[PDB]
Write a protein that binds this DNA or RNA. Structure first.
Ligand SMILES: Nc1ncnc2c1ncn2[C@@H]1O[C@H](COP(=O)(O)OP(=O)(O)OP(=O)(O)O)[C@@H](O)[C@H]1O
Lengths: 216, 56, 395, 56
DNA sequence: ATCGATCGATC
DNA sequence: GATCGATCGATAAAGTTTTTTTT
C-alpha cells in the first residue's frame, strides 16, 4: 500500500506463504517517523558527501581465507547459557532456537578463529531479540481464529433450530447475521464462513443465492 | 485563425532559431558550477518545511 | 485474374488464369479493377514427352499474350457540353442538398440526419498539407450503433455499388487489414516483396467493416495507428517502408445488454477503447420507438418494393471532386465559435463531453457542404446545417 | 550516484499532445522517438535477430 | 552449361 | 600398353501466416 502500516499485524501486508516465514531465522524491518532530531541529522549527512583502515579488497581476502581454513569447535561454556535462553523463551519452538547457533558460530569464527566464545552469544541473542520486537502488534497466530469460529458456531445452530425444512436463502443470511455484532467485517466473512463448514456436514453451495442446510 | 493563413503569426514574440540555445546548452555544458556552502544551510530546513506538512 | 464472383453459380470457388502483357499497358492495372482484356490463346513448354519419367504431370501452361487492357464500370466518365451544363442548371436551386438526400436510398424511411451524413462523407473534404508541418485529419470517419434489426447494416453495402473504385472488406479477424506480414512467395525464385493487403485499394476511397466489439485484440491495435497517422510502416522480415494511404472508415456495432441504452450511462456503453471513440466524432444511437402511424406507414413500404437517379448521382460527385475549395469567410468563422463556446460550457451539463478536435469537424462538415454548392466562396448558410446535425448527434 | 532526473506527464486533452512534447524531441540533440508498437521492452534494449545472407 | 570420368582408338 | 581425345552423364534451387490446445 504505502508503508509498513504500524498498529496492525505487519504480516498481512506482505502476502506470503506462512511456511516460508519459518524458512527465515530472523527478520527485521526499518523504522520511520517524523523524527525531528534524526531526519534533521540525516539531512546533515546529505548536506555533506557532495561538496569538494577502510579497504575494498584487503578485507575480502581476509574473509575468503578464513571461511574455509578454520572450522571451530563448541565447548560446554556456551550450552549452559544457551538452554537458559530457551527456558526463558517459553515463558516458535526450535527453528528459531536452532539457527541462532548457526550465526553464533560465525561471530566466534570471525575474530577468535579457534573455538566458540562463551559470551559472543550474549549479543547474538540481542540480534534475534530485535526480531521478536517486530511482532508485538493467519501466519503463526491463532487469536483471530479463536474469536471467529466460536462466534460462527452460535448463529448456524440457531438457524438450524428455527425451521421445519433446511431453507437458508441468501437474502436471509445477509440480513440478521450482518446485523448481529459489528466486530466482524461486512462482506469479507460471508464467503469463507461456509467452505470450512462445507466439510463438516452442514451446508451445500448452489450459487450466489439459495442453499440447503443440515437435517436431523 | 490557423486556417485563414498558412502560418501561425501570433503571441508578439520574435522567433529564435533552435541552433542558438542548442549552442547555449553546449555553452552551459562547458561550465558545471560548484555549489557553495550558503545553500545547504537553508535547504536543510526547507526539507523540514517539506516534512511536517506531508505528515499533517 | 480471378472470376467476377456473381455470374459464376456457386458450385465452386473462383478459379484463375494468367496473362503476360507488354510495355504499352504496364502499371495500368491496380489490384481491384474490373478489367477487360483480349489476346491470343497460347500453350508453351515441353510436357509429357520430356527425356524420362514425366508420368501424370501436365505440361501445357496455358497463357495469354494480349493487348488492349480496358477498365470498366459496372474515371472513364466522359461528358459533353450538354450534360455538364445540366448539372450547372442543377446547381441552381436552393434545395439540392435536400433533394439529393432522399434520392439516395429508395427503400427506407426517414433518418435524414443519416441520409445527409452519408453523401456529406462520401464526397469528402480536402486536406491542406502543412508546408514543413504535419497535415491534419482531412478525412472523415463516422460511426453507427443501434438496437438490432433496424437497417443499420442495410445502407452500408449499397454505397459499394456507387463506390467509384472504393472496394471494402467485411472485417474478418485477420492481420492484414492494413499490412502485408511479409508475404512474398519467392517472387519467382529469389525476390522478396511486401504485397499490400487492403490499403493499396483504400487510397482516396472508402471502406466499411462490421462487428467492431466482436473482434479479438489484434485489430484494436491495428486501427489505433492507422487513424491518428495517415500511413503505416513495418519491417516484418524485410525493410521499413512508409507507404501512404488516404482512407476513411465506416463503422457498425451492436450494444451487448439488449434494450439498455436509456437506463444506464449513455457513454461507456460498449467499452471498446475510447481512443477510437475520441478519434471518431459522430455516434448515432438509432431509436426504434413505437408510433402507430410510423409502423403503419412502414407496413406498406415493405409491400411496394417487389417489382434524381443513380448514374446521374455518381457523375455529380465524381465531377465535384475536382473543383475549387474556398475555405475562407471571415464572418462564417465568427458565428461558429459562438456556436461552440456555449456548448463548450454546456458539455458537462448535458449528456456528452466534447474535445478540442471537434472544432476541426465543425469546419470540415461545412467545407464539404460548400462543395455540394460548387462555389468558390464559404457562404453563411453552411453554418446552420453543421449546427443542428451535431445537435441531433448530441441531443 | 544518480543524475539525469526524469519528469512524467499525465492528463487527457483532445489536442493529441504528442505535438506538444515530441516536436521538441524532433529538434533536440540525440533525442530519439518511440511509440507503443514495434520496439517493446525487450525491443528497447539490444537483441539478436535474423539478418540477410551476410553475417547473421 | 560445364566439368569430370570412362572408354576407345591410335601410336 | 599407355596416353590422349571425345562423348556422355551428373550437378548447381527456396521457406516462416493460419490454426491448435494451454496457462
Ligand atoms: N427502419 C427500417 N425501415 C425500413 N426497412 C427496414 C428497417 N429496418 C429493417 N428494414 C428491412 O430489413 C431488411 C434488412 O435489414 P438488415 O438486415 O439491414 O438489419 P441489420 O441492419 O442487419 O440489423 P443488424 O445489423 O442488427 O443485424 C431490409 O430489407 C429492410 O427493408
Amino acid at each position: 500500500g504505502s508503508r509498513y502500516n504500524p498498529n496492525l499485524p505487519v504480516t498481512e501486508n506482505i502476502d506470503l506463504p506462512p511456511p516460508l516465514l519459518s524458512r527465515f531465522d530472523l527478520v527485521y524491518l526499518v523504522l520511520d517517523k517524523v523524527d525531528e532530531k534524526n531526519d534533521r541529522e540525516l539531512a546533515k549527512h546529505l548536506t555533506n558527501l557532495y561538496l569538494e583502515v577502510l579497504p575494498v579488497e584487503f578485507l575480502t581476502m581476509y574473509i575468503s581465507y578464513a571461511k574455509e581454513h578454520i572450522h571451530p569447535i563448541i565447548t560446554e561454556a556456551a550450552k549452559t547459557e544457551l538452554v537458559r535462553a530457551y527456558v526463558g523463551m517459553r515463558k516458535a519452538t526450535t527453528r528459531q532456537l536452532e539457527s541462532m547457533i548457526r550465526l553464533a558460530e560465525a561471530h566466534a569464527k570471525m575474530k577468535l578463529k579457534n573455538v566458540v566464545e562463551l559470551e559472543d552469544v550474549q549479543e547474538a541473542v540481542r540480534l534475534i531479540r530485535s526480531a521478536i520486537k517486530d511482532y508485538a502488534t493467519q501466519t503463526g497466530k491463532s487469536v483471530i481464529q479463536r474469536k471467529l469460529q466460536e462466534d460462527l458456531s452460535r448463529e448456524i445452530m440457531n438457524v438450524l433450530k428455527d425451521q421445519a425444512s433446511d431453507s437458508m436463502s441468501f437474502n436471509e443470511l445477509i440480513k440478521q447475521i450482518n446485523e448481529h455484532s459489528q466486530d466482524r467485517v461486512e462482506s469479507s466473512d460471508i464467503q469463507e464462513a461456509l467452505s470450512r463448514l462445507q466439510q463438516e456436514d452442514k451446508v451445500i453451495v448452489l450459487g450466489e443465492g439459495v442453499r440447503r442446510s443440515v437435517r436431523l | 485563425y490557423v486556417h485563414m493563413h498558412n502560418k501561425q503569426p501570433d503571441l508578439d514574440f520574435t522567433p529564435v532559431e533552435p541552433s542558438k540555445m542548442r549552442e547555449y546548452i553546449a555553452y552551459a555544458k562547458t561550465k558545471r558550477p560548484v555549489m557553495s556552502e550558503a545553500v545547504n544551510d537553508y535547504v536543510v530546513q526547507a526539507y523540514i518545511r517539506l516534512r511536517q506538512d506531508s505528515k499533517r | 485474374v480471378q472470376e467476377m464472383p456473381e455470374m459464376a453459380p456457386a458450385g465452386q470457388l473462383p478459379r484463375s488464369i494468367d496473362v503476360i502483357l507488354d510495355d504499352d499497358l504496364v502499371d495500368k492495372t491496380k489490384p481491384g479493377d474490373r478489367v477487360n482484356v483480349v489476346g491470343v490463346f497460347k500453350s508453351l513448354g515441353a510436357g509429357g514427352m520430356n527425356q524420362s519419367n514425366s508420368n501424370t504431370l501436365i505440361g501445357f501452361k496455358t497463357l495469354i499474350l494480349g493487348n488492349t487492357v480496358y477498365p470498366l464500370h459496372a474515371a472513364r466518365q466522359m461528358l459533353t457540353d450538354f450534360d455538364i451544363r445540366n448539372i450547372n442548371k442543377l446547381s441552381k436551386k436552393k434545395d439540392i442538398f435536400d433533394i439529393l438526400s432522399q434520392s439516395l436510398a429508395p427503400s427506407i424511411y426517414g433518418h435524414d440526419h443519416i441520409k445527409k451524413a452519408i453523401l456529406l462523407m462520401l464526397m469528402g473534404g480536402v486536406e491542406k498539407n502543412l508546408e514543413n508541418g504535419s497535415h491534419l485529419r482531412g478525412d472523415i470517419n463516422i460511426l453507427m450503433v443501434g438496437d438490432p434489426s433496424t437497417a443499420k447494416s442495410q445502407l452500408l453495402r449499397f454505397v459499394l455499388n456507387t463506390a467509384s473504385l472504393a472496394i471494402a472488406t467485411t472485417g474478418r479477424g485477420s492481420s492484414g487489414v492494413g499490412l502485408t506480414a511479409a508475404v512474398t512467395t519467392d517472387r519467382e525464385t529469389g525476390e522478396r516483396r511486401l504485397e499490400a493487403g487492403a490499403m493499396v485499394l483504400a487510397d482516396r476511397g472508402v471502406v466499411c467493416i462490421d462487428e467492431f466489439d466482436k473482434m479479438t485484440d489484434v485489430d484494436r491495435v491495428a486501427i489505433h495507428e492507422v487513424m491518428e497517422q495517415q500511413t503505416v510502416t513495418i519491417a516484418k522480415a524485410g525493410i521499413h517502408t512508409t507507404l501512404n494511404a488516404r482512407c476513411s472508415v465506416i463503422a457498425a456495432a451492436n450494444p451487448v445488454f439488449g434494450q439498455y441504452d436509456v437506463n444506464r450511462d449513455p457513454h461507456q456503453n460498449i467499452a471498446l477503447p475510447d481512443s477510437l471513440l475520441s478519434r471518431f466524432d459522430l455516434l448515432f444511437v438509432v431509436t426504434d420507438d413505437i408510433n402507430e402511424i410510423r409502423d403503419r406507414s412502414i407496413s406498406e413500404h415493405v409491400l411496394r418494393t417487389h417489382r434524381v437517379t443513380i448514374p446521374f448521382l455518381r457523375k455529380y460527385v465524381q465531377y465535384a471532386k475536382e473543383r475549387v475549395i474556398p475555405q475562407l469567410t471571415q464572418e462564417a468563422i465568427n458565428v461558429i465559435v459562438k456556436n461552440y463556446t456555449d456548448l463548450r460550457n454546456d458539455d458537462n451539463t448535458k449528456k456528452s463531453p466534447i474535445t478540442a478536435r471537434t472544432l476541426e469537424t465543425l469546419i470540415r462538415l461545412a467545407t464539404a457542404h460548400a462543395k455540394v454548392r460548387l462555389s468558390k466562396t464559404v457562404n453563411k448558410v453552411d453554418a446552420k446545417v453543421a449546427a443542428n446535425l451535431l445537435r441531433f448527434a448530441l441531443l | 550516484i544518480r543524475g539525469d532526473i526524469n519528469v512524467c506527464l499525465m492528463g487527457d486533452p483532445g489536442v493529441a499532445k504528442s505535438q506538444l512534447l515530441k516536436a521538441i524531441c524532433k529538434i533536440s540533440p540525440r533525442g530519439v522517438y518511440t511509440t507503443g508498437k514495434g520496439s517493446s521492452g525487450v525491443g528497447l534494449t539490444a537483441a539478436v535477430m535474423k539478418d540477410p545472407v551476410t553475417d547473421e
